[PDB]
Amino acid sequence: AARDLICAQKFNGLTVLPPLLTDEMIAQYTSALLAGTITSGWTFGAGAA
Amino acid sequence: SQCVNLITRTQSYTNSFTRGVYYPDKVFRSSVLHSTQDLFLPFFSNVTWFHAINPALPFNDGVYFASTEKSNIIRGWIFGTTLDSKTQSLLIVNNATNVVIKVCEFQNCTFEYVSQPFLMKNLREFVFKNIDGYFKIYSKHTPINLERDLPQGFSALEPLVDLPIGINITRFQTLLAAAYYVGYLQPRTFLLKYNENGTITDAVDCALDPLSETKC
Amino acid sequence: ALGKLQDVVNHNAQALNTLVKQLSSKFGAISSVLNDILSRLDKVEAEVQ
Amino acid sequence: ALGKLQDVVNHNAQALNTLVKQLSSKFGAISSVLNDILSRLDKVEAEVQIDRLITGRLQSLQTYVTQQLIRAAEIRASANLAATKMSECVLGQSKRVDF
Amino acid sequence: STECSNLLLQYGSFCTQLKRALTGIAVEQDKNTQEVFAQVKQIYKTPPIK
Amino acid sequence: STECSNLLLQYGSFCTQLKRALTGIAVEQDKNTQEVFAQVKQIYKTPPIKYFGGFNFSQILPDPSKPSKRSFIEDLLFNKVTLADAGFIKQYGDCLGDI
Amino acid sequence: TLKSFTVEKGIYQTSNFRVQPTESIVRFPNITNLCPFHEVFNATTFASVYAWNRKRISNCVADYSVIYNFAPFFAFKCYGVSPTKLNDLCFTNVYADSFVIRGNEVSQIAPGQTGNIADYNYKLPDDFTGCVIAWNSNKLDSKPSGNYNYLYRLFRKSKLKPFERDISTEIYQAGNRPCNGVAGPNCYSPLQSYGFRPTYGVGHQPYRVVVLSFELLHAPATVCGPKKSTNLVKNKCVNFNFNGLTGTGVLTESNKKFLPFQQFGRDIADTTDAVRDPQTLEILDITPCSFGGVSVITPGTNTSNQVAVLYQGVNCTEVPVTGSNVFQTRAGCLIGAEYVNNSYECDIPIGAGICASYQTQSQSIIAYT
Amino acid sequence: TGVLTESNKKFLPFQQFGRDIADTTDAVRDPQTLEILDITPCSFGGVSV
Amino acid sequence: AGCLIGAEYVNNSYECDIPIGAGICASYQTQSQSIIAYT
C-alpha cells in the first residue's frame, strides 16, 4: 500500500544507472593504497614498491 | 475467347537480398545521409518465385514486381478490387508496342490515360505503389549474371510515370516460360547514402537487427 | 561530520522529486492528465491542450 | 592519444550543426520557411505563425549559448591548469608527487 | 500516447541533446571515480605479521 | 524579413545579452592562450652549435626548412588532429564557387 | 549601440551589413486557359453526399475573385491559405467537389471531425489545405410536398477513410436473421431520404457545399494565376519567384546533374540550394548575397574623433552596399587604417596577428603586426 | 493501461479513487463489484547495444 | 544493470574494454570469434 518515491520515479520515465565500480572494488583500491603506504613509504608512487 | 492456357502456377519462396530501393522524393541531394519514412520492402524478406509453365494476388500497400525473362512474355498488369463488371470495376491494363494505360473500366467507356511513350541477361524491377490517388510506378533496367537468384548489390529505382486514379485496389493479376517475383511493401524507415552525384549507392534498414538500429 | 556527501545525496534526490512533481501541473490546459484531454475533446482542441 | 583536442573540435562542430539543423523545424506552425508563411496567409495568422517560429528559434539559440558558457568554464579551468603546469614544470623543478 | 509523440516530433532535436548531455554527465562520473581511486597499478597487501 | 524583425523587437533584450555572452567567451579564449603561452618576456634563440652534453633535442627544436617554424613533433601533432578550417580565409569567397 | 556618449579605446561590434536586391523577377509557366468554376458553382442539380462528383482542374489561369459573383455565401472559408492571397502563389493540381447536406452537419466538413457524414459519407484529410464554400439553398432544394431527391447513409460496418466514396446499396445486417434483400426486423435500408421542406427552421434547411482542395506537392505547377512573367537575369542579387520560391539570392549557372523528374536541389544546407526554371529547361544555382559583421576600431572620444571600420569575412572586392586606406587582413578587410612596416605591442586587437594603435606620427590610426 | 492486481489497501467506504505523487492513479474501485484493484504500469526500460 | 543477451559469461578477469554496469565489462576475443562478458 505504501508506494515508494523510487517506484514513481522509475515509473514516470526516470532511470538511475548503477556505477561502474562497486563499493567492494573501491575498498580494494583503498586497501591497496593503504598497504603500499604502510609497507613502502613514498616509493610505490614513483616506480616499484 | 476465354480459354485456360497454362494457368497452373507453382510457388517457391526465396530471399529479397537487399533489392528494391527507390527515390522517395523529387529533391536532388549530394553526399547526404538522409532518413526517409516510406513504404519500402524490408531487407532479407520473403519474396516469391511464381512459376507458370492464375486466380489473383492480394495487393497490399505496394508490390515489388520483377521479371528475368528475356522472351518478353511479361507485357501488362491488371489491378482493381474485383476484375469484372458492376461494383469496384477497374483496369490498369498495359501492353507492348506503344504502351497505353487504359483505365476504361469494365462497367462502360469511362475515363482514360491513353498516354503513348514506350515503357521499356537482364532483370527488370518494378514497384507499384497506390498512395493519395497517384499510382506511382518505378523501374530500373539492370544487367544480371552469376546464375539464378536475386543478385547482391544496390540498384536505385528511378521513377517512370505517375497516375492519379483515386481508387480501391485489392487484387493484382499479371498478363501473359514465365517466372516473376512478387514482394510486398510495409512502412519502414531507411537511411539512404548519396554519393557525389544523386545516385543512391547504399542503404540501411533501421529495423532489421540492433546493429542497424545503432547505425541509424 | 559528513554533511557534504549527505548534501550530494539530497540534491540529486530532490531534483528528481521536483521533476516527478512537475507532472501534476496544468500549464494553462484543462487537465494535467493526457488521457482525459484525449478522451474529452475533438482533434484540434486536444491538440492545443 | 590526442582525443581531448579532437573532442574540442568535435563538440563545436556538433553544436553548430545542431543549431543549423534546428532551422528546419516547424514548432507547431504550418511551414518552416518564413517566405511561405508571408506568401500564403494574411497579416494576423501569419503573424501568429511567425511568433511560433520566433519562440522556437529563440529557445534554440538560448540553449546553444548556455552550453557554450558551460564549455567555456570547463576550458578555462583546463587552461588555468595548463598555465600552472607551464610555470612549475617547465620554468622550474617540481617536488609535487605525480605533478 | 501516439498523438503526443506525433506533436512532439515537430519540435526538433531537443531530446537528442538532452540525452547527449545526460550521457556525458554519466560517463564523467565514472571518469571522476577512476581518476581519484585507481591511482595504483598493482593490488598490494599487508603481510600477516602486524 | 521586416515583419519578423518587427515582431522580434517586442521580445525585449534577449539578443543583446546573448551577444554579450558570446563576446565574453571570445575574449576569454584569447585571454586563455595569452596566459598559457606568453610567459616569457624575450624571444631567446638557441646557439648555432648543437652540443648539449650528448642530449640531442633535434626533434623538438625548430628547423628552417618549413615555411612555418615548427618542430618535427609539432608537425606530427598538427597533422594528427583533423581540424577544420572553420570558415577562416574568406568563407563567402570559398562558398561562391561552382561546386 | 553602447547606450553611452563616451566610448573607451577598443574594438566594438556595432551591426551587420548586407547587399540589397536590385530587381525582382517572376517566372510563371505559359498558360492561357480559363476554367469553368461557373460550371461548379452554378448548376441545376447537385450530387448527393454519398455520390459526390469530383472534377479535375489542371492547366488553368484561375481568377478567384469571380467566385463571389456566382454564389451568395456568407464566408469564403479557407483553412491553410488566405482567400484573398490566391492570385500570387500557385500550386499544381486543383480539385472540385459538390454535394448537398443539411444545416446540422455543416460544421462536420472539417479535418479531424466526428459525425454521421464524416464517418459514413464524406471524410476530409487531417492535413487539408484549400477552400470550403457553403451556402443555404432553401430557395432551390425545398418543395412543399417534400424534396426526397437527396439521400444520405446512416448504417455501415466501418468508418470511411479520407477522400472516399461509397455508392453501394445493400441491406444492413442489424441482427442475426438474414435480410436477403427484404426489409423487416433488424433489416434497415442504408439510404435514408431527406425530407427537405421550406416550412422548417433554420437548422434543418438544405445547404449547398462546394469544396476546393489544393494539391501542394513537388510536381511542376499547372494552375497559376494571371500574374505577368519577367525576363531572366543572372549573376546579380535579385528577388526570384521561380515556382513558389520567393527568396533573395544570386543566380549562377549550375553543374548539379538533375534527374529528369527532379525539380529542387536541397543539400544539407537545405533552403533550395538549386532550382529549375519553368520557362526554359536549364539548371541554376542559389547562393545568398554578400553579408557579414561590422566592427568599429577607435580610441576614446576624450583623445580623438577618428575611427576605423573592419568588415569580417570580406576581402573588400565587394565591400560597398579616413576613407582611402584599404588594407587586406585575414580577419576580413580593413577600412580607414594605414599599414606600416613596424612592430609594437598590441593596443587594439583586430584579428590573426594584426593589431591597431593610435599613433602620434599628423595623427592617424595605424595597423601593424 | 497497466496491470490490474488484487489490492490490500484500506479504502474507507466514502473513497473511490487512489492517488500518489504526480497524479498517479494507483488504485481504482470497480463500479459493479466492491473490490479494490491496484494499477501498476507494464514492464519497460532501456535497450543498449 | 539488467540482463545481457548475446554475450557469454566467462570465469576470467581482464581489463575493462566496454563498460556495462556494476563491475561487468565486455570485449571481443579471438579464442571461434565471440563476444564475452566478465568481471
Ligand SMILES: *[C@@H]1O[C@H](CO)[C@@H](O[C@@H]2O[C@H](CO)[C@@H](O)[C@H](O)[C@H]2NC(C)=O)[C@H](O)[C@H]1NC(C)=O
Ligand atoms: C638526433 O636525432 C635525429 C633524428 O631526428 C638524428 O638524425 C638521423 O640520424 C640517422 C643516423 O645518422 C640518419 O639515418 C637519419 O637520416 C637522421 N634523420 C634526420 C637527419 O632527419 C640525429 O643523428 C641525432 N643526433 C645525433 C647527434 O646523433
Ligand SMILES: *[C@@H]1O[C@H](CO)[C@@H](O)[C@H](O)[C@H]1NC(C)=O
Ligand atoms: C518464407 O516463408 C516460408 C513459410 O513456410 C518459410 O518456410 C521460408 O523459410 C521463408 N523464407 C525465408 C524466411 O527466407
Ligand SMILES: *[C@@H]1O[C@H](CO)[C@@H](O)[C@H](O)[C@H]1NC(C)=O
Ligand atoms: C475496398 O474493397 C474492399 C474489399 O472488397 C471493401 O471491403 C471496401 O469496402 C472497399 N472500399 C471502398 C471505399 O470501396
Ligand SMILES: *[C@@H]1O[C@H](CO)[C@@H](O)[C@H](O)[C@H]1NC(C)=O
Ligand atoms: C558522378 O558522375 C560522374 C560523371 O557524370 C562520374 O565520373 C563519377 O564517377 C560519378 N560519381 C559517383 C558515381 O560517385
Ligand SMILES: *[C@@H]1O[C@H](CO)[C@@H](O)[C@H](O)[C@H]1NC(C)=O
Ligand atoms: C511555353 O514556352 C516554352 C519555351 O519558352 C515553349 O517551348 C512552349 O511551347 C510554350 N507553350 C505554349 C503553350 O506556348
Ligand SMILES: *[C@@H]1O[C@H](CO)[C@@H](O)[C@H](O)[C@H]1NC(C)=O
Ligand atoms: C447557370 O448556367 C446555365 C447554363 O450554363 C445558364 O443558363 C444560367 O444562366 C446560369 N445561371 C446564372 C444565374 O447565370
Ligand SMILES: *[C@@H]1O[C@H](CO)[C@@H](O)[C@H](O)[C@H]1NC(C)=O
Ligand atoms: C578574396 O580574398 C582572397 C583571400 O586572400 C583573395 O585571395 C582573393 O584574391 C580575393 N578576391 C578577389 C576578387 O580579389
Ligand SMILES: *[C@@H]1O[C@H](CO)[C@@H](O)[C@H](O)[C@H]1NC(C)=O
Ligand atoms: C448491477 O450489478 C450488480 C453487481 O453485478 C448487482 O448487484 C445489481 O443488482 C445490478 N443491477 C441491476 C439493475 O441489474
